[PDB]
Amino acid sequence: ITNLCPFDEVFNATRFASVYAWNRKRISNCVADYSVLYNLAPFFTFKCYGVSPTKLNDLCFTNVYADSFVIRGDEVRQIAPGQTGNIADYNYKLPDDFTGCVIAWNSNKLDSKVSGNYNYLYRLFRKSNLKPFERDISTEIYQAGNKPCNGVAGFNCYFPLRSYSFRPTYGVGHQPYRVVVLSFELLHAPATVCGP
Amino acid sequence: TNMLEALQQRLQFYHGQVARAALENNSGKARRFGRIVKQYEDAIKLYKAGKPVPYDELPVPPGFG
Ligand SMILES: *[C@@H]1O[C@H](CO)[C@@H](O[C@@H]2O[C@H](CO)[C@@H](O)[C@H](O)[C@H]2NC(C)=O)[C@H](O)[C@H]1NC(C)=O
């Protein structure tokens, strides 16, 4: 196979899915040239897990899954195996064993309107923490207190998810950072996403 | 119940309203709800600083229980 993998499509998307509903993309039957990430994207955080980036360009994979979402810069550190936090516990959870890369870069220019941005959403209230590599898009009202409500109200029911308010005025900590997560398994038995 | 719990309750409810408005892709509703949240966080900051909290100046809350 010689057709190139659609990494440019996922890294150049106009808008990324909200973290509570993080987009999952399948990459298969293509050659993956990761030198694009190093050559382009002047600002990035490519710190990866389970494989060295150069060796990553070297070896051959068999299953590549790309997860994309938007996270504030101050809490971008929560994307890691065995790490706690609101994002890790509620929106996106990575298993303790993990063989894949994480890429994060600021997107104030792209995802912060002058008046303000509210498209991106994240979850704050839920009964139990998320299992690894599991998605939760339910919008049911939380049972924070001891009073069942069945509808949004003042008392301890609340909305399960919260909206960001990104603005260019905010500092680097609160600025939105476009985060994409790659997942690999290097057993290579079918070897369908092999590199060059 | 005084004022602090009620203020945080209204703050959380209007944050949920902002999130719902954003989820519904409504722009102006989300902007107005965010402005209301801005005044409410200013009011809770003022009350934490010790300044008196008003009733009519802030928008009325929903049917809280
Ligand atoms: C779209 O993605 C690609 C790479 O993922 C970039 O667009 C161009 O890519 C070529 C390499 O194939 C570079 O030589 C060009 O310099 C890239 N364009 C620019 C403007 O740098 C780029 O990351 C994305 N496009 C834009 C407009 O950001």
Numbering used by the authors:
A (entry chain M): 332 to 527
B (entry chain P): 1 to 65
Could you share sentences copied from the article?
As a proof of principle, we computationally designed several de novo protein binders to engage four protein targets: SARS-CoV-2 spike, PD-1, PD-L1 and CTLA-4. Guided by these general principles of molecular recognition, we introduce a protein design approach based on the critical importance of the fully buried patches of the interface to drive protein interactions. Overall, our surface-centric approach captures the physical and chemical determinants of molecular recognition, enabling an approach for the de novo design of protein interactions and, more broadly, of artificial proteins with function.
We selected a site distinct from the ACE2-binding region, but overlapping such that a putative binder could inhibit the ACE2–RBD interaction. Adding these three mutations to DBR3_02 resulted in DBR3_03, which showed a KD of 80 nM and was folded and stable. In virus-free assays, we observed that Fc–DBR3_03 had comparable potency to that of imdevimab (REGN10987), an antibody used clinically, for the wild-type (WT) spike and bound to the Omicron strain, whereas RGN87 did not. Neutralization activity in pseudovirus assays was tested, and Fc–DBR3_03 neutralized Omicron, albeit less potently than the AstraZeneca clinically approved antibody mix. Importantly, Fc–DBR3_03 showed a very broad reactivity to many SARS-CoV-2 variants, which is attributable to the sequence conservation of the targeted site and the small binding footprint of the design. The design was sensitive to the L452R/Q mutation present in the Delta, Lambda and Kappa variants, but introducing a single point mutation (L24G) to relieve the clash between L452R and the binder led to the design binding to Delta.
